[PDB]
Design a protein that fits this description.
The chain has a single domain, classed as Rossmann fold (3-Layer(aba) Sandwich). It is globular and about 55 Å long. Strands 3-2-1-4-5-6-9 form a seven-stranded parallel sheet, with helices on both faces. The longest helix is centred in the N-terminal third of the chain and has 21 residues. It is about 40% helix and about 15% strand. By secondary structure, it is α/β, with parallel strands linked by helices. The relative contact order is 0.13. β4, α5 and β5 form a beta-alpha-beta unit. It is classed as oxidoreductase. Keywords: cinnamoyl-CoA reductase, short-chain dehydrogenase/reductase, oxidoreductase. The assembly is monomeric.
Length: about 325
């Protein structure tokens, strides 16, 4: 793997920082794109093992095609992870969809071996019709109008970006593999708190006063990073890959948190118990397991998320 060069888009982000860290540990040369290499929020990347010799931070934006050409030039592979993470369609849609087309086109011109695209469970799950008992897997796609009508614009953007990626890759003859993570937790390498981790932080700060009657899937950030690498490196990898460890009710989540962190104002009350407690849905992560990926149990992952938030100043012990 020595002498191999890969681009990671949006390299200073939550998932991408772990991806860059592990790529460098494995011996890769990495060209990580960030909007401003001199911004202190990217400083953690420079301090990674191997970064001094093998990490270049390339100034780029998803909507600046030439900047992407410069970053991707000479790469063997591209991990396209950069995206807005927002339900504001004015912020979400163009960098997701046009940005993704731009990345695939730059990768095609650079003659890269493979692109791995970070999609989401949001591109898989959000289908009104799908029977509740059906196993959620890679054959499932979300309903766009439904995402649109429910103002799930983040899910819409990820889905349409994924569709654009397949379409453009097909047209340009690019080997594309897609990973679809569920909600990602784990320790943060970066200084700020990204969207997925806010979902845990709100319980520890007590800004969340109750927990909803709902379930969703969780996965550890280190597993997600390893999975991106596994999809790049395995010649036979093909299509989409659901990346998820287990599904938990929010009630289960706050129980785990409150047992680990009894000093914090984690909510104990369900928002609304008018309906029976929602049961975890069935899913398959067999595709990734079949490639050898082992998933870290969610409890460990949640614990490490809070310890990280504490280290980084976000959770002083209450008085
Ligand atoms: N965390 C999860 O639960 C989860 C689950 C499924 C999928 N994903 C996907 O995982 C990927 C990474 O997200 P994340 O959770 O790690 O969030 P994150 O920390 O917010 O990372 C997103 C990165 O994308 C960037 N970016 C946004 N717009 C850009 C643009 N126009 N040009 C260049 N870079 C841009 C960011 O840069 P700036 O900091 O400069 O804005 C940021 O580094 C995304 O594709 C996301 O949709 C995440």
């Amino acid at each position: 793997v020595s002498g191999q060069v890969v681009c990671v888009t949006g390299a200073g982000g939550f998932i991408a920082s772990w991806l860059v860290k592990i790529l460098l540990e494995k011996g890769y040369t990495v060209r990580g794109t960030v909007r401003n290499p001199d911004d202190p929020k990217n400083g953690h990347l420079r301090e990674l093992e191997g970064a001094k010799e093998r990490l270049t931070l390339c100034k780029a934006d998803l909507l600046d095609y030439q900047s992407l050409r410069e970053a991707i030039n000479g790469c063997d592979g591209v991990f396209h992870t950069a995206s807005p993470v927002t339900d504001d369609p004015e912020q979400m849609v163009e960098p997701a969809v046009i940005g993704t087309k731009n990345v695939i086109n730059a990768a095609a011109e650079a003659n890269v071996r493979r692109v791995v695209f970070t999609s989401s469970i949001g591109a898989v799950y959000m289908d009104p019709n799908r029977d509740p008992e059906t196993v959620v897997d890679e054959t499932c796609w979300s309903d766009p109008d439904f995402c649109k009508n429910t103002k799930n614009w983040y899910c819409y953007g990820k889905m349409v970006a994924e569709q654009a990626a397949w379409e453009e890759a097909k047209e340009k003859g690019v080997d594309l593999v897609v990973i679809n993570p569920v909600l990602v937790q784990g320790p943060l390498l970066q200084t700020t708190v990204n969207a997925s981790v806010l979902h845990i932080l709100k319980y520890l700060t007590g800004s969340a006063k109750t927990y909803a009657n709902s379930v969703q899937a969780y996965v550890d950030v280190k597993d997600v990073a390893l999975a991106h690498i596994l999809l790049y490196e395995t010649p036979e990898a093909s299509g989409r890959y659901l990346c998820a460890e287990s599904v938990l009710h929010r009630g289960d989540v706050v129980e785990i948190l409150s047992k680990f962190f009894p000093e914090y104002p984690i909510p104990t009350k369900c928002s609304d118990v008018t309906k029976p407690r929602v049961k975890p849905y069935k899913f398959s992560n067999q595709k990734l397991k079949d490639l050898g990926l082992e998933f870290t149990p969610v409890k460990q992952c949640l614990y490490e998320t809070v310890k990280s938030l504490q280290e980084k100043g976000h959770l002083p012990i209450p008085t």
